[PDB]
Design a protein around this nucleic acid. Structure first.
Ligand SMILES: Nc1ncnc2c1ncn2[C@@H]1O[C@H](COP(=O)(O)OP(=O)(O)OP(=O)(O)O)[C@@H](O)[C@H]1O
Ligand SMILES: [Mg+2]
Ligand SMILES: [Mg+2]
Ligand SMILES: [Zn+2]
Length: 351
DNA sequence: AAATTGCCGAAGACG
DNA sequence: CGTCTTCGGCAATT
C-alpha cells in the first residue's frame, strides 16, 4: 500500500533528463556571468543542494535548489539576540554593501538579484523569468517553462572556513549513529550564511544573515547508515529515504488544500526525521520489511513535536522551529487534527 | 584558470 | 533479484 504510493512518487528518468538539461544550461550561464571582471561576486562557486540532489524529491523534478557560495575571509559574527541562527556580519570590494561596519544581507542580495535579472532577459532560447521578490527570503527564484513548470532557487551564500559558531556546539548529535570521526570531519568543513532576514524585531532586520547546513545535510543523506554499506551495491537497502518521502508527501498534500498550514515546510519534516535517525540508529530498524511501522514512528514523533510546540533545529538546539513566535499554536493544533485523521483512516489523502 | 575528461555511486527501467 | 543506463560529483589534466 505505501509501496503503491512510493511507486507513484518515484521520479521518471525521461522527466529527469528533460528537466536537468534545461536547468543545467540556465545555471551554468548564470554562474558564468557572475565571474565577469569587476563583479563583486567574482569568486562564487556552485553547490547543488536540496531535495532533488539528495534523491528525496517526490512526484516530479519541478523544483531545484542551487547555492552560489562566496569565500569571504576574516569575518566576525555577532549573534542577533538569542536565536542562535541569525547573525550580523562585520569585517576584520564589497565595500558598498556596508551599513556602518555591518555587511548588509539586503544590499548584497539586491545587487545579486539585479545581475541575475539582466542575464535572464538575455536568454532567448529558453522560456525563463524571475519570480516576484519575496520579503525576507534569501533566494532569487527562476520560473521556467520547458513547457513543464520548473522552479530554481538560486541562493547566495557566504562561506567561512573558521570553526562553527558556538550555538552549534551541542548540535549534530550523530555520535551513536554516524560516529565521532564523521562528526569531527563534518565540523571542519566550512559553514555558510545565507541572506534570509530575521523576522523578529518586526518585521525583517535587513542586515541579518542565517546559518545554512545544506552541505552537511547533503552528505548525511548520502551517508546515512550505521553500517558503511547501507544502500551500497554490496550492502543492504534501508527505508530511511522512503519514509522521508511519505512524510513529505503527506504534508505537501495537506498544504495543497488548507491555507492555514502555510508556514509549515518540508524542512520541518526533514528535521523531524534526522532526530528519528539519531533516536533509531541501527540499520536493522530501517529494514524495508518494516516500512509501515517506521512511517508510523515518524508520524507519532511529529505529532509529539506539534503538541509540545517544540522542534529543535538539528544543528542548533537553542533554535525552536515550532516556537510560539514563527508558528501560532492554533496552526499546530490544526495540523495535529489533519494528521490524526489521515492516520486513523488509512490515509485517504494519498489519492 | 577555464574547459575536458575519466571514474564510479545512486537509482530508474525492465525483465 | 541482476543488469543496463543516465545523472551527478570529483579532481587531475592540459
Ligand atoms: N526554514 C529553514 N531552515 C533551515 N534551512 C532551510 C529552511 N528551509 C530550507 N532550508 C534549506 O534549503 C534547502 C532547500 O529548501 P526547500 O524548501 O526547497 O526544501 P527541499 O529540502 O528541497 O525539499 P522540497 O524541495 O522537496 O520541498 C533545504 O534542503 C534546507 O537545507
Ligand atoms: Mg527544493
Ligand atoms: Mg527551494
Ligand atoms: Zn540505507
Amino acid at each position: 500500500k505505501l509501496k503503491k504510493v512510493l511507486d507513484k512518487l518515484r521520479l521518471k528518468r525521461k522527466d529527469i533528463s528533460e528537466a536537468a538539461e534545461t536547468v543545467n544550461k540556465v545555471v551554468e550561464r548564470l554562474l558564468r556571468r557572475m565571474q565577469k571582471r569587476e563583479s563583486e561576486f567574482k569568486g562564487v562557486e556552485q553547490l547543488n543542494t536540496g531535495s532533488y540532489y539528495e534523491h528525496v524529491k517526490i512526484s516530479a523534478p519541478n523544483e531545484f535548489d542551487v547555492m552560489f557560495k562566496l569565500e569571504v575571509p576574516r569575518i566576525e559574527l555577532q549573534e542577533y539576540y538569542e536565536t542562535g541562527a541569525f547573525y550580523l556580519v562585520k569585517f576584520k570590494p564589497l565595500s558598498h554593501f556596508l551599513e556602518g561596519e555591518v555587511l548588509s544581507a539586503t544590499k548584497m542580495l539586491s545587487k545579486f538579484r539585479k545581475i541575475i535579472k539582466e542575464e535572464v532577459k538575455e536568454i532567448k532560447d529558453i522560456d525563463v523569468s524571475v519570480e516576484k521578490e519575496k520579503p525576507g527570503s534569501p533566494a532569487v527564484t527562476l520560473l521556467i517553462r520547458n513547457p513543464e513548470e520548473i522552479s530554481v532557487d538560486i541562493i547566495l551564500a557566504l562561506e567561512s572556513k573558521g570553526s562553527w559558531p558556538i550555538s552549534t556546539k551541542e548540535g549534530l548529535p550523530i555520535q551513536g549513529w554516524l560516529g565521532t570521526k564523521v562528526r569531527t570531519n563534518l565540523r571542519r568543513e566550512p559553514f555558510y550564511l545565507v541572506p534570509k532576514n530575521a523576522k523578529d524585531g518586526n518585521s525583517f532586520q535587513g542586515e541579518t544573515w542565517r546559518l545554512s547546513f545544506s552541505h552537511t545535510e547533503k552528505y548525511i543523506l548520502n551517508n546515512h547508515g550505521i553500517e558503511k554499506t547501507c544502500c551500497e551495491s554490496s550492502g543492504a537497502k534501508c527505508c530511511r529515504k522512503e519514509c522521508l518521502k511519505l512524510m513529505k508527501y503527506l504534508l505537501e498534500q495537506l498544504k495543497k488544500e488548507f491555507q492555514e498550514l502555510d508556514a509549515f515546510c518540508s524542512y520541518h519534516v526533514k528535521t523531524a526525521i534526522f532526530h528519528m535517525w539519531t533516536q533509531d540508529p541501527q540499520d536493522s530498524q530501517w529494514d524495508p520489511r518494516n516500512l509501515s511501522s517506521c512511517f508510523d514512528k515518524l508520524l507519532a514523533f511529529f505529532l509529539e513535536c506539534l503538541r509540545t510546540e517544540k522542534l529543535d533545529h538539528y544543528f542548533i538546539p537553542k533554535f525552536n522551529l515550532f516556537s510560539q513566535e514563527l508558528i501560532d499554536r492554533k496552526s499546530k493544533e490544526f495540523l495535529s487534527k489533519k494528521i490524526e485523521y489521515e492516520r486513523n483512516n488509512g490515509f485517504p489523502i494519498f489519492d
